[model samples]
Target: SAVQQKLAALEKSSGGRLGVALIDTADNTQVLYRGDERFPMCSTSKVMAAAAVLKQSETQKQLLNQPVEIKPADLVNYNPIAEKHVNGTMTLAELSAAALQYSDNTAMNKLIAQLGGPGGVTAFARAIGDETFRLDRTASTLNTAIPGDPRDTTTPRAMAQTLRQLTLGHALGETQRAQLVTWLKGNTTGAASIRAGLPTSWTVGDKTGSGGYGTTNDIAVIWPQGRAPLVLVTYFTQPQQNAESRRDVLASAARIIAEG
Candidate 1:
């Protein structure tokens, strides 16, 4: 298929490992390239935390409204929102928004802590029938991105499948799904990645993850004009020395998949 060929060419030009899973929910047609290979998840796992919290909110009723205190010790690198809330408090929903929309490390940790620990969200993924999505460490430790270490990793195919299940698979209630979409849609990150390849008129919601070893990723649910939704997950990694994540690699991949 054009998508597979073009994506392969793109990966070759990138000079890095690329894993992709593109699924058209309308017809269930898919195009994959090294999609089963594991890659460090980075912050992409935040969405899973948000989903788990939202799912709990469904039954807890006031779960999202409950405030969780933040201590200075809780803050981690890349915690823009959590740092501000240190020594204060934020609602669970606020933490969810910070984690998903801003990739707040502390907020993500708090949400994970609320669920128990890193394995808590992993358990959530398992309960939701996502066997591949796993979280083994907190934000700071997980970003290490050790080469060949599969502790905090997920395959592109698995991430895309799980996103499909959460976003369109009826895994969450209608309200919960809507809240999740709203958070992802409002994401301040990912401007140069998936969204860059799409037209302004198209509706897109995505989660981004970045880590050491030049890991850059985006998992998205896109709605093209007058067409059914499509889910795309791209995970890319390169050598550690002088490592630089090219956001355009993700953009270019999205363009290839969208154009096809």
Candidate 2:
């Protein structure tokens, strides 16, 4: 009850709508605050893309080892990896790393294309028992973050459930899941959100997203050293165009969830 109350106060002061889902792996305890509402996914969907690619790797021999040539056409905003390697080739595994760890737009686009596009990712989510996940646009388009639009969106609860299964459940093979975890743990962009709230001694691997309309989000698997993991998802949205995505709100939300 205190968790919800604290989260409620935080949301009210945040000047935005917030949704959260925190699941304790030890006994499967859950705390949800507006977790069923839709929120624009932005680059956070990159993790799903990475997981889908890994899932495909299970049956397709050498899938991760396959080479992809990066061209000028493949470049998109926030695409450091592809820009540096233009006209050069990188393996699917390398692209996955760039997408998950660096949030490289081009890397994610290529990965999405590998599985037949965004719908393929949605299919992967469905196969993994996450019926509420939806992805309709490529990286550039989805980051538009149209106010109140439901396309290219998912609920906080769905994101947490999907990540829980992908990382801690049987949704992925050992090798694939481990690779996914490694990339998330090495994420270059999450320091200011969920990771900021936790103690340095605790281990956290997360995917962060930001977009227009003040959509800021993080989905994470957190390990408080020597304990079972906790899966947490926090999504925030403000109606104003180009509103600030408050890192403090997300940080405070994670702190509250972790403390609870």
Candidate 3:
């Protein structure tokens, strides 16, 4: 229907490929737009990695409270958002906070390593019923271009399902989900994506990922002011790298999903 037409329009206008999974929490009606295709997840992989960290936290007390040193080893020469604050230490909780709230590469890399690399994250995703989710590299080695290195991949439907499971108090556990959602609620990164499509009064909890390889993605739990809350996962592989255009596609996609 119109959503498909709108999606096609977005694909053309943004010069990208879109995979959307919009879940209506009220009726559980699911809509798909190329939702089964694999797309590079970029830093959104951190959310998957976060589940591993949380699982470990269950058995290890003070897991989130313990401090970790930020040495030169932790810093990647490229796109070092969390590494700029090197020569200091922060708690694991602080590290996770930075990684999630701001998509900090250094912090995320540390978390990935702490969890036994990409395999641990992949295991977590699979355990949560996301069979196709994959994580193959650390933040230090991520490439924006998805030529052959689809280092991180997941379909829109699977991701939205996992996020919905989290929201429903499953997978990583209810307590962790609450805490994680709390962390996502404060994310300030994706101002132009799904958040742009939402009303200012609506509450949003989301994670945004951007890569050099035509990727602009967001997975969000949106609480529209007067309507029931829903989960939205939007992914794109677009040729144009312009930020504004990327965000417009996301905003347009959200409106189309929300209006339906």
Candidate 4:
């Protein structure tokens, strides 16, 4: 109820454009605010994409450490680090880690390709019983071209479900699940909106997606007080605000949820 009230306030204050969902993993208590409505998922979709790959690998027992050559053209569209250095190769593990840790768009695209393309990722999601989630092909393409696309859409409820699957060890096998969780834990993008309001010592495994056009989103698993954990999904979309204003709005909403 506190989550509902806070979310309502956030929506009203932000002109009814904020969508959020908080799931208390301890007892499955859920609070939603416009959570069923879809908004661009930004890089958050990569989390699902990564899970799909790891799951597929588990089913096939494929070696994740196997070297995958990074061709020149692959580097063109799939190497986020190439912009800073002229690296020529990376392993499947590196690509996966980069996707989670850096929110690397190019690395995500490559991982999607390695997992047998975006369609494969969607099929895997479906196999896991996520019926409401789908990959936006156009948005994925734009993500490659423009880095992060505000048009890539998903609902907070669906995102929360994805995290729930991971945390419950229901989506992938133990080994792959551990690998995915470890990668998520290594995420270095701490300036995420939802995390800004959490206690400094709270350990969070998360990925953030933001771009111009007032799109900001974070999907996170919070480990606090040594409890089971909680899933927090937050999204904000509008057209006129700057980055600081958008972060302020998201941080305020996150503080309410954190305290609740």
Candidate 5:
């Protein structure tokens, strides 16, 4: 079995219960390595929130360029970008870019607020084909336990499916997609993980998420030279593994998919 032959060897070194989904866009064939189990989304929820806001901006032309100021309350001691930009004025486009590129909490919180909080974002996702996501809180509550709500959650397969749909031009226009991709490509979050295993000919654009229970995960689109991109989502969850080790796990996973 490939599980025993391929996946387990990788898991043995990586540690943790890894949930992975690898999809070849050219053939539309999906390969799952324990991909169905749900996991906490952490900042990856920003992707969904960004998409929802962009969908609204697509219809409401004025919203994207509109100016909004960062309030003092948006600041959290942990957010470096917000700390630097507190009381700074930024356009909606800038906010979105910061959230996607740097995984900025201040920016993500602003976008989520514009979407009318978590409920509205969930509605937007359900209106599309993704009914499997839950966005019940913003980055403000990250690492803090949510009462009845699951902070935010998704499965590896659902993330890959979402990425595939977006690449196919589901909700946004060419201009908007390009804008989003520019920031996605600017992501500097997980260099040691999914971003580590490049084949020299391919470019990767992705989002990384971390939450409680020692979770570190990445979902991405790998664009090979002149070929359809591959969408892959990898989740690393286990209290035993540190961030460095989980990243090695992701790096190994990327190499396995890229080479095989």
Candidate 6:
């Protein structure tokens, strides 16, 4: 089949270090191409963190518009926009948007802190029934802490499951789910992944992660007309390689699944 052939080609091209998975939510159809191996999730883990925020807010019934202040000390090794915006008051909604849309590490770090730090996010992930996800010690502190241990992680299957739950409204209430989808739709990073292969007119709700010697990953839900929504997760790591090459590899893998 075309899908099988694509998988075979990818396996050869990636030297067996790539892991990819896709699920057609409509019929419960699934395909796995080197999906058993665990890989660093990069910024894709932020989606899990976002979900944790929503869960915490749900119990508190706090409106997204409520203002939260960012501190200057949180801006280490993170994007400048988030750092510049620190000390400026903004609603939780704006912070979430900035975090996912721009892959703003500072925004994410601030939000994580607002949620009572990494431990809080991890606790929320557990409450949502995801046991495989964990916050590395490095990722657990303010963005100014370390560039992160370069080892934060999650599996492709687990990521897909998380997206599925979000899409199905199982992870948050309808309002929160809609907000999450909106934020994801605006994600501009990881354009080389799922967004790279789809038609310009098609819409993809996704997040991309990149860091360390060689780490790139993307998790997204593709909504195409007349077709079932597809959850795709692609991850790659070549600690000895460069970022551009890692991104190119991830892009190729995403194109295969998108076209499949």
Ranking by lDDT: 2, 1, 3, 5, 4, 6
Off by over 4 Å in 6: 1-5, 138-151, 241-245
Cα lDDT tens digits for candidate 5, 104-184: 888888888899998888887787788788888766643532222354787888888887676555666676667677777
Q: Least accurate stretch of 10 residues (summed lDDT) in model 6? A: 140-149
What lDDT would each prediction earn against the true structure? Answer: 0.89, 0.91, 0.80, 0.73, 0.76, 0.72
Judged by lDDT relative to the true structure, which candidate is superior, 3 or 5?
3
Model 6, residue 70: distance off in Å is 2.2
Tens digit of per-residue lDDT, candidate 3, span 15-77: 678989988888898888999988888778788777778878878856888777888777763
RMSD of 6: 3.2
lDDT by residue (tens digit), candidate 2, 166-196: 9988799889999999999999999899999
How many clashes in candidate 1?
Answer: 0
| TM-scores for every predicted model | 0.97, 0.97, 0.92, 0.86, 0.91, 0.87
Which of 2 and 3 is ahead in TM-score? Answer: 2
* Candidates in order: C-alpha RMSD to true structure: 1.2, 1.1, 2.2, 3.4, 2.5, 3.2
lDDT of 6 by residue, 1-260 (tens): 68758867876776536777788888887777666657777678788778777776787787567887777666656554576666687777777887888887777876787777777777777777777677764342332111224345667777777787876547888777887888898888867776886666667899988765466678888888877788888877664544343566766766777676
Q: Model 2 — which ten-residue stretch has the worst lDDT? A: 139-148
Pairs clashing in candidate 3?
16-238, 144-212, 144-213
Off by over 4 Å in 5: 1-4, 141-150, 240-245
The sequence of per-residue lDDT tens digits that candidate 4 reaches over residues 1-260 is 86687778777887637877889888998878888987777678888888887887785686567555555445443346533433455666777888788877667777778767677777777888877677755223334212234335668898888887975556889988888878877888746477788887777888877754567778888888777788888888775544333766677777888888
lDDT of 1 by residue, 87-169 (tens): 88999999999999988999999999989998889998998998998788987733587778988899988899899989878
